[PDB]
Amino acid sequence: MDTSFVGLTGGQIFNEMMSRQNVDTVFGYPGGAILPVYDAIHNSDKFNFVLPKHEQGAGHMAEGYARASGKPGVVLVTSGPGATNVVTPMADAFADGIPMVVFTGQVPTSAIGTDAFQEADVVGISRSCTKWNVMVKSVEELPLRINEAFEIATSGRPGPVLVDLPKDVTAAILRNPIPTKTTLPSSRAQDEFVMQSINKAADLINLAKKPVLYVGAGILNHADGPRLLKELSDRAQIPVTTTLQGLGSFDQEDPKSLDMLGMHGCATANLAVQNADLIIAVGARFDDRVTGNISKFAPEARRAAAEGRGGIIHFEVSPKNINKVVQTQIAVEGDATTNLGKMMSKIFPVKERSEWFAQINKWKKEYPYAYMEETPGSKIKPQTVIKKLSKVANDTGRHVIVTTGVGQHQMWAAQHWTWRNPHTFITSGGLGTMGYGLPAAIGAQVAKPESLVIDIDGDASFNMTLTELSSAVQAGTPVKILILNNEEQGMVTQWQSLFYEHRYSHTHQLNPDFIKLAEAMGLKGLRVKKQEELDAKLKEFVSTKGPVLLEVEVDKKVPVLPMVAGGSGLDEFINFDPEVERQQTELRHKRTGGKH
């Protein structure tokens, strides 16, 4: 038994457990139900507290913080609307496997189930969007629940967890000693089984003639992931493609880089995947934005599997994602990085793959990320902004972190930025939450105070959570907000152009003056609309001390390409064509009655 907490309130015990869980930052917003805990963390030296203007912001900040630091993001909000306001961030963290512990205040246990003031069944509401949740029934179990929450959030596939805290529990004084284990954080047959699958994976890899590494976020859940990935890639001469969430795990400057695959992935990455005899999936879940039409996915690997000379190998940590989308030949369970390390010595060094590399190189010259570049008098092109910013940012020599909103700017940031470092791309992929950009950048900056943190946002996405601009000033986070303003919900207008004969239904919102907004919010505001001024503005943007927002007026109705949609296979993509763009433009003006 442990009696060291006897005499303390639940709130004080909460405060105490934070330092035991190595928590240095908490994102939250005060409220009645959670007051006992706030009174306990008042002036606390155990951690920095970050206050947003809206709980959703606290949630996204916590995600960005977790994505940038590798530590779970901690949220502390009140009951009722406080808790319902964090459902989106939880669903978002759940989709992208982000470690987060959400503490929600709750009405007194005696008022639960009486439709009490600011009462919500948060445990019920968040059941499907948390790896686990619970309502603390007594102060005696507060330490146990906190410890279980942190452990569950950061293990297996990371994810969000919620802990409901009744006000009478946090205000209550602990009058009983409690088990020592509940107050302290944290099979040979199985090991042999994993080692057996590792040997099978090695044998299969040593047999491959056209292998491809399909890499995702999982490789970033271990400090040595990128390093071991590169070792394997070099040792067996295997080209590497990453998902949107795997960007930064592999140096794109390396000859063996295939760039991103998927719906809007590089044509070369998609073609390599469709023609590979062996796909080595590492920390990726084969989501529907990556596979294209599943029945058309990886035909050559499927053919090789039927002939027992290839197929798909999957390094997955969660049983839920093993053989959930496609049949795999070998599943290596557990942490990918760890398993890559164990397999390495069994992989035969390869001298070269001239044919495979030659084929891949022909595709690279044939299918670059082409787009309609600037022309005299034309508006600035969004893709051009990303390419230029990437260069300017990288040249500073500083550690760079990029967050984004959801939409075309997001895809263009993914395609045209040159990814080289682990944990430098923080974006909402699974749930695709517009508004993620700003708050995520604020959280990321708190995690890495010395990094140059850039939010490449869209105008519609930015509007969702622009109130957090004042939070950036109050928090002292010198974030660089970039708004690629096309005065439209681009992602949606693109789909409307393609599948709904150019009928833009409610996808054009009236924007506020972003520069005046920035100034009203307390930061520097910059705007650029002329090609000749882009370079200077990007320069000023990056070198400005303090938070700053830069709006770039960009061309409208520009589609993201290449694109694989509907029943198309990864190799049946739409490619950029200047002539077609011009024809589609004319067709658009007619159909919209000249409105767009």
Ligand X SMILES: Cc1cc2nc3c(=O)[nH]c(=O)nc-3n(C[C@H](O)[C@H](O)[C@H](O)COP(=O)(O)OP(=O)(O)OC[C@H]3O[C@@H](n4cnc5c(N)ncnc54)[C@H](O)[C@@H]3O)c2cc1C
Ligand Y SMILES: CCCOP(=O)(O)OP(=O)(O)O
Ligand Z SMILES: COC(=O)c1ccccc1S(=O)(=O)NC(=O)Nc1nc(C)cc(C)n1
Paired residues of 482 in beta bridges: 456, 550
Is 472 annotated to bind a ligand? Reply is no
The two structure tokens encoding residue 88:
């989106």
Pick one of Mg ion, ligand X, a second copy, none as the site partner of residue 486 (Cβ within 5 to 8 A by kind). Mg ion
Among 490, 547, 559, 569, binds Mg ion (CB under 5 A): 490
Question: What DSSP string runs through 230-241?
Answer: HHHHHHHT--EE
Is residue 407 a contact residue for ligand Y (CB under 6 A)?
A: yes
Contact 490, 514 (CB under 8 A): no
How far is 12 from 46, CA to CA, in rounded Å? Answer: 12
Contact 274, 299 (CB under 8 A): yes
Is residue 431 a contact residue for ligand Z (CB under 6 A)?
A: no
Is 88 annotated to bind a ligand? Reply is no
455 or 488, CB closer to ligand Y? 488
3-state secondary structure of 493: helix
Is 275 annotated to bind a ligand? Reply is yes
Quick one: CA torsion of 363, 368, 369, 371, rounded to 10 degrees?
Answer: -130
Q: How far is the CB of 97 from ligand X (least distance, A)?
A: 4
Contact 529, 380 (CB under 8 A): yes
168 or 277, CB closer to ligand Z? 168
Catalytic, 531? Answer no
Q: How far is the CB of 329 from a second copy (least distance, A)?
A: 21
Residues numbered 481-520 forming contacts with ligand Z, rule: CB under 6 A: 491-492, 495
Q: How far is the CB of 488 from Mg ion (least distance, A)?
A: 5
Binding mask 460-499 for ligand X (x = CB under 6 A): -------------------------------x--------
Which one of the spans 71-79, 285-293, 445-453, 454-462 is the region binding Mg ion (CB under 5 A)?
Answer: 454-462
CA 37 to chain centre: 30
Residues numbered 15-34 forming contacts with ligand Z, rule: CB under 6 A: 32-33
Quick one: CA torsion of 29, 31, 36, 37, rounded to 10 degrees?
Answer: -20
Catalytic, 372? Answer no
Catalytic residue among 260, 491, 521, 563: 491
Is residue 109 a contact residue for ligand Z (CB under 6 A)?
A: no
Is 248 annotated to bind a ligand? Reply is no
Specify the residue for token string 């939250």: 28
Specify the residue for token string 């879940």: 285
Specify the residue for token string 């040997």: 199
Catalytic, 373? Answer no
66 or 517, CB closer to ligand X? 66
Which one of the spans 364-372, 480-488, 527-535, 570-578 is the region binding ligand Y (CB under 6 A)?
Answer: 480-488
Q: How far is the CB of 428 from ligand Z (least distance, A)?
A: 12
Catalytic, 117? Answer yes
How far is 37 from 104, CA to CA, in rounded Å? Answer: 10
Q: How far is the CB of 585 from ligand X (least distance, A)?
A: 22
Catalytic residue among 18, 21, 27, 55: 55
The two structure tokens encoding residue 83:
């808790």
With CA atoms as reference, report the closest residue to 564 among 269, 137, 233.
269
Is 270 annotated to bind a ligand? Reply is yes
Q: How far is the CB of 490 from ligand Y (least distance, A)?
A: 3
How far is 321 from 78, CA to CA, in rounded Å? Answer: 34
Which one of the spans 139-147, 451-459, 506-514, 557-565 is the region binding Mg ion (CB under 5 A)?
Answer: 451-459
Backbone angles phi, psi at 161, to 5 degrees: -135, 155
Strands of 294-432, DSSP E: 311-316, 330-333, 400-404, 425-426
Contact 471, 53 (CB under 8 A): yes
Bond from prior residue into 239 cis (ω within 30 degrees of 0): no
Binding-site annotation: residue ranges: 55, 157, 264-285, 316-335, 459, 486, 488
Residue numbers belonging to the annotated binding site for FAD: 157, 264-285, 316-335
Q: Which residues are catalytic?
A: 55, 117-118, 167, 491
Binding residues for ligand X, rule: CB under 6 A, are: 96-97, 117, 157, 216-218, 221-222, 243-246, 260-265, 283-285, 287, 289-290, 315-318, 321, 335-336, 406, 410-411, 429-430, 432, 491
